A paper describes a structure:
Second, the ribonucleoprotein telomerase elongates shortened telomeres at chromosomal ends using a reverse transcriptase activity. Although the human telomerase holoenzyme is composed of multiple accessory subunits, catalysis is localized to the telomerase reverse transcriptase (TERT) subunit.
This substrate mimics the initial TERT:RNA complex bound to telomeric DNA (state A6). In this orientation, an unpaired 5’ cytosine (rC) of the RNA strand acts as the templating base and a 3’ adenosine (dA) of the DNA strand serves as the primer terminus. Crystals of this complex grew in a P3221 space group, diffracting to 2.5 Å resolution. Residues I196, V197, S198, G309, and R194 compose a pocket around the templating RNA base. This pocket uses both polar and nonpolar interactions to stabilize the templating rC in a conformation that orients its Watson-Crick edge towards the incoming nucleotide binding site. On the opposite side, the 3’-OH of the primer terminal 3’-dA points towards the catalytic metal binding site, and side chains from T341 and V342 coordinate the deoxyribose sugar moiety of the 3’-dA with nonpolar interactions. This binary TERT complex also has a cavity in the active site that forms the nucleotide binding pocket. Collectively, the active site of tcTERT is primed for nucleotide binding, and the residues involved in binding are highly conserved with human telomerase.
Numbering used by the authors: 1 to 596
DNA sequence: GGTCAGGTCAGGTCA
C-alpha cells in the first residue's frame, strides 16, 4: 500500500552503534566508518558520493553495477526537489543478486526483501545523516528547488545577520521568560536575508486566527472598494489611451517591516464595534505589539514592523497599506492607470511628468528597491518598454502582455513540477496513472486565462506565442515525468505513452479555443483549432529534441504521422518562433548531476 | 437523471 520513499532529510534516523539480529553484520562495518567519518575535521570541501564510497564497503554491493544502482538513488537525494519521492521497489528491483556475497546463504526468494531493508537501513541511518551532517537544505522558493549550503557557511551568514538585527534594534533580548510564539529563521535571499518566524503549531487557536483573518478581510471589503481586476484596468486604460503609454513599476522594500505598529493599532481600534468587538480588537493589538521569537535557546522581542511568517501579518499589512493608499494615492489623474499587488506598484499615464511625479510621490512615502525599478521614461538611466509586474510582462508601446518566466540560467526545470504525492501514491506497476496525473490541466491553468488569450488588447501573434510558451512548459513537465517513469517506475513498455500524450494535446488546444473565443477582440482575425494543435505538437517537438536518442522514435512518430500547419489567418506572425526553442528555455538544464 | 450550491482534494499563480 506504501510504495514511496521520500528523498527528504527529515526522514533520517539516528544510527545504532550495532545492528540488530534481523540485519546482517556487514552493516556494522559501514556504521563504524560512519562514526569515524564524523570525527574527520572536514574543513576542506567534500563530495558526499566520495565519502560514502569510503564508508560503505564495496563488499556490500559486490559488483560495480550494483553499487552504481544504489548511488543513483543517493544522487537523486543530493539533487532533490521538495516533495520528491522514488518507488521503494527501486531499492531492490533489477539488482544482480548473484554478486552480493552476504546474500548467497539465504534462499533466493527471500533476497529482494532483505536487500530492500538493508538498502533502506543504509539510506536512513548513514546516507541522509551524512548529508545533514555537512549541509543544510534551503528552499530557493523558485518552484520546488532545494539548494544545499555548507553548514559552516550558513551558520556564519546566520550569525552575521543576527548581530545586524541586534545592533539595529529589530531584535531585542527579552529576558522576562516570556513564551515565544515560534522560532526565528534567517534565510538567504540573494545579497540580503529574510527574517521570518515559523509558528509553533497552535491546534486549539488557529480556528480563532482564521476567524480574525476573515473579519479583517471583511473590513477591507467594506472600506476601500476593490482595486479592480488587473486585467480590466489594463484593458480599459489601453482602450482609453491612444498616445504613447508611459509607466513605472516600483518595489517597496520590507513592507512588513516598515509598518508603523502604532499607526496600525489605531486603525484596528477605529474598526466599528459591530464588525470587530473590543476584546478582539485588543487581542490583535497586543498580538502585533508583543512578537516574541526564539533564536538559539534565547527569547527575543521582534521590534521592527510585522513578523513575516505570522498568520495575521498578511491581512494586517494589507489593511495598513490600504490606508496608506488613500492617504497618498486617492487623488491621481483618472485618465491614468494604477495597480498595487502588495508591495509592488505599477502606474501608467500618457503624460511623462505624471509618471515622474508618481515616482517621487512613492519615494517620499516609502523606501524602495531602486535596482528593482523598471520604467520606459526616456530620460531614466535604463529605460525599457517591457515592465514585469505581477507575473506578467507588459509592453507599454505595443500594449501586448506575455507571461513572465522565472528560469535563471542553469536552473533545473524539473524543480517547477511536483510529480510525487505522498498522500496518494501510485504503484510501480501503474505508470499510466502517474503520467496522466502529471498531465492534469490544473497545473498550467494560470497561463490559460483571458489575460493571455484575449484579443482585446493582444495581437494574435502574442496570443499564439503565449500558448506556445505555456506548451513548452507542459512539454518540459512531460519530459521530467518521463525521466521519473524511466528511473523509478523502470518502465519498459512505452506504448501507453501516446494515448494521454495526444489526449492531453487535444484538450489543451480545446481549452485554449473556448478561452480565446470567449475573449474575442478587435485585433482577432481568425485562429484555427488545428493551428493550436499544430503549435502544441511543435512545442513538444522543440523540447523532446534536447534528448533526441531517447525520444527519436517519439519525435519521428508524431513528426511524420502527425500534422504541423502554421497557416494561421494572420500575416504578421513570424511563425519562425514556433519552429525553434525560445531563448528562455534554451538555457535551462534537464540533466541531474550532484555537486555537493 | 440534471442541476445547483456547498465541502474535500489536487498542482499551479501572486507578494
Ligand atoms: Mg490557510
Ligand atoms: Mg519585494
Ligand atoms: Mg495577502
Amino acid at each position: 500500500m506504501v510504495h514511496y520513499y521520500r528523498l527528504s532529510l527529515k526522514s533520517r534516523q539516528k544510527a545504532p552503534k550495532i545492528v540488530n539480529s534481523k540485519y546482517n553484520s556487514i552493516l556494522n562495518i559501514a556504521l563504524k566508518n560512519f562514526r569515524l567519518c564524523k570525527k574527520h575535521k572536514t574543513k576542506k570541501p567534500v563530495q558526499i558520493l566520495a565519502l560514502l564510497q569510503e564508508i560503505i564497503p564495496k563488499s556490500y554491493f559486490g559488483t560495480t553495477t550494483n553499487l552504481k544502482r544504489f548511488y543513483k538513488v543517493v544522487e537523486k537525494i543530493l539533487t532533490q526537489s521538495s516533495f520528491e519521492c522514488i518507488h521503494l521497489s527501486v531499492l531492490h528491483k533489477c539488482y544482480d543478486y548473484d554478486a552480493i556475497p552476504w546474500l548467497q546463504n539465504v534462499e533466493p526468494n527471500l533476497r529482494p526483501k532483505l536487500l530492500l531493508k538493508h538498502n533502506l537501513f543504509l539510506l536512513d541511518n548513514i546516507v541522509k545523516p551524512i548529508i545533514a551532517f555537512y549541509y543544510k537544505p534551503i528552499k530557493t522558493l523558485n518552484g520546488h528547488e532545494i539548494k544545499f549550503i555548507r553548514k559552516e557557511e550558513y551558520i556564519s551568514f546566520e550569525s552575521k545577520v543576527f548581530h545586524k538585527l541586534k545592533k539595529m534594534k529589530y531584535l531585542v533580548e527579552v529576558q522576562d521568560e516570556v513564551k515565544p510564539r515560534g522560532v526565528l529563521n534567517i534565510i538567504p535571499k540573494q545579497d540580503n536575508f529574510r527574517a521570518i518566524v515559523s509558528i509553533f503549531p497552535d491546534s486549539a487557536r488557529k480556528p480563532f486566527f482564521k476567524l480574525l483573518t476573515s473579519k479583517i478581510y471583511k473590513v477591507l471589503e467594506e472600506k476601500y472598494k476593490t482595486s479592480g481586476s488587473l486585467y480590466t484596468c489594463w484593458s480599459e486604460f489601453t482602450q482609453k489611451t491612444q498616445g504613447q503609454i508611459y509607466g513605472i513599476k516600483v518595489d517597496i522594500r520590507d513592507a512588513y517591516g516598515n509598518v508603523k505598529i502604532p499607526v496600525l493599532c489605531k486603525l484596528i481600534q477605529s474598526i466599528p464595534t459591530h464588525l470587530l468587538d473590543s476584546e478582539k480588537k485588543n487581542f490583535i493589538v497586543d498580538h502585533i505589539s508583543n512578537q516574541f521569537v526564539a533564536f538559539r535557546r534565547k527569547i527575543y522581542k521582534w521590534n521592527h514592523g510585522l513578523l513575516q511568517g505570522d498568520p495575521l501579518s498578511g491581512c494586517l499589512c494589507e489593511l495598513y497599506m490600504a490606508f496608506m493608499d488613500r492617504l497618498y494615492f486617492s487623488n491621481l489623474d483618472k485618465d491614468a492607470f494604477i495597480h498595487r499587488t502588495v508591495d509592488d506598484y505599477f502606474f501608467c499615464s500618457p503624460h511623462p511628468h505624471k509618471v515622474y511625479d508618481f515616482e517621487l510621490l512613492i519615494k517620499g512615502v516609502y523606501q524602495v528597491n531602486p535596482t528593482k525599478t523598471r520604467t520606459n521614461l526616456p530620460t531614466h538611466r535604463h529605460p525599457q518598454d517591457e515592465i514585469p509586474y505581477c507575473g506578467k510582462i507588459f509592453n507599454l508601446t505595443t500594449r501586448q502582455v506575455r507571461t513572465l518566466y522565472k528560469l535563471p540560467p542553469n536552473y533545473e526545470i524539473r524543480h517547477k513540477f511536483k510529480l510525487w504525492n505522498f498522500n496518494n501514491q501510485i504503484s510501480d506497476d501503474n505508470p499510466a496513472r502517474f503520467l496522466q496525473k502529471a498531465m492534469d490541466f490544473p497545473f498550467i491553468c494560470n497561463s490559460f486565462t483571458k489575460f493571455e488569450f484575449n484579443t482585446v488588447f493582444n495581437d494574435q501573434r502574442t496570443v499564439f506565442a503565449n500558448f506556445y510558451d505555456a506548451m513548452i512548459c507542459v512539454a518540459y513537465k512531460f519530459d521530467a515525468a518521463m525521466m521519473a517513469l524511466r528511473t523509478s517506475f523502470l518502465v519498459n513498455d512505452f506504448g501507453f505513452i501516446w494515448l494521454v500524450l495526444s489526449s492531453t494535446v487535444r484538450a489543451y488546444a480545446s481549452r485554449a479555443f473556448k478561452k480565446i473565443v470567449t475573449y474575442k477582440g478587435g485585433k482577432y482575425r481568425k485562429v484555427t483549432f488545428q493551428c493550436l494543435k499544430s503549435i502544441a505538437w511543435r512545442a513538444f517537438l522543440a523540447v523532446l529534441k534536447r534528448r533526441t536518442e531517447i525520444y527519436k522514435g517519439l519525435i519521428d512518430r508524431i513528426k511524420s504521422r502527425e500534422k504541423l500547419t502554421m497557416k494561421f489567418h494572420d500575416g504578421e506572425v513570424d511563425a519562425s518562433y514556433f519552429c525553434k526553442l525560445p531563448e528562455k528555455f534554451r538555457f535551462v538544464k534537464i540533466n541531474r548531476k550532484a555537486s555537493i
